[PDB]
Amino acid sequence: DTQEVNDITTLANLHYNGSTPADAFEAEVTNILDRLNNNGIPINNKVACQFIMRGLSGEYRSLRYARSRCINMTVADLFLDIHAIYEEQ
Amino acid sequence: SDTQEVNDITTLANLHYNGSTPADAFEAEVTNILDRLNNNGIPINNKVACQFIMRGLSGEYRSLRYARSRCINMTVADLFLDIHAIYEEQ
């Protein structure tokens, strides 16, 4: 009953600093976006990008410098950058 | 401006009302958030909007959360009337 509200809240309160696997973070955010699109709440690529960048902490905060191109960025590309920084760790 | 949708969704997720501000301004802020989100392509159902507004109710207005069983059964307008009733009584 609250699946949409909890998913939107978790999308709004994303937080990543590299202490957990970047692949798991990517997959769980993708599940949030997928359940929200199936429940009637479409999240554009720019909006999902903005949320994920607001959630990046630590070295990943560096990625926020590209936040001007959140429209030009892709959720997949941002997730790949996160995976690269995580592989460097 | 570019992040307007994210800011509106964040404000909708962290609503907070306890009666210290006018209920008209609170209703207006919730309605503006919902309207901008629907105009930008993010439709918030009546049940979802009710759940969001009720999660924010504090103080005596916490009593209103007891009607949370009727989220689909209740419109945003009815919740706003309840909030206005408690505020006018205060």
Author numbering:
A (entry chain B): 262 to 350
B (entry chain A): 261 to 350
How did the manuscript describe this experimental structure?
Ty1’ is not subject to the canonical CNC mechanism and is instead restricted by DRT2, a gene present at a fixed chromosomal locus that encodes the Ty1’ Gag CTD equivalent to p22. Drt2 also associates with Ty1’ Gag while forming VLPs and likely uses a lattice-poisoning mechanism to restrict retrotransposition. Therefore, we included F323S in Ty1’ CA-CTD constructs and in Drt2m F323S/Y329S (SS) for crystallographic analyses and F323S/Y326S/Y329S (SSS) for biophysical analyses. The asymmetric unit of wildtype and Ty1’ CA-CTD (F323S) crystals both contain two monomers arranged through a single Dimer-1 interface and the Drt2m(SS) crystals contain four Drt2m(SS) monomers arranged as two dimer-pairs through Dimer-1 interfaces. Further comparison of the p18m dimer with that of Drt2m(SS) reveals the strong similarity demonstrated by the 3D superposition of RMSD of 0.7 Å over 155 Cα backbone atoms. Inspection of the location of these divergent residues reveals that in p18m and Drt2m the three divergent residues lie at the center of the hydrophobic Dimer-1 interface. By contrast, in Drt2m and Ty1’ CA-CTD, it is the V266 sidechain on helix α1 that closely packs against F312 on helix α3 and because of the greater steric bulk of the V and F residues the distance between the V266 and F312 Cα atoms is increased to 6.8 Å. Concurrent with the increased spacing in the VTF interface of Drt2m and Ty1’ CA-CTD, the side chain of the conserved residue R315 can adopt a rotamer that allows it to swing in and hydrogen bond with T270 which is not possible with V270 in p18m. Thus, this “arginine-flip” mechanism provides a further level of discrimination and specificity between AVL and VTF Dimer-1 interfaces. Therefore, p18m(F323S) and Drt2m(SSS) form dimers in solution with sub-micromolar KD with some tendency for further p18m(F323S) self-association at higher concentration but that in Drt2m(SSS) is largely suppressed by the introduction of the triple serine mutation.
Saccharomyces cerevisiae prevents uncontrolled retrotransposition of Ty1 subfamilies using distinct mechanisms: canonical Ty1 is inhibited by a self-encoded restriction factor, p22/p18, whereas Ty1’ is inhibited by an endogenized restriction factor, Drt2. The minimal inhibitory fragment of both restriction factors (p18m and Drt2m) is a conserved C-terminal capsid domain. Although the crystal structures of p18m and Drt2m are similar, three divergent residues found in a conserved hydrophobic interface direct restriction specificity. Structural and genetic analyses of p18m reveal that p18m and Ty1 Gag interact through a hydrophobic region that is shared between both proteins, termed the Dimer-1 interface. These observations suggest a lattice-poisoning model of restriction by p18m in which the CTD binds full-length Gag and forms dead-end intermediates in VLP assembly.
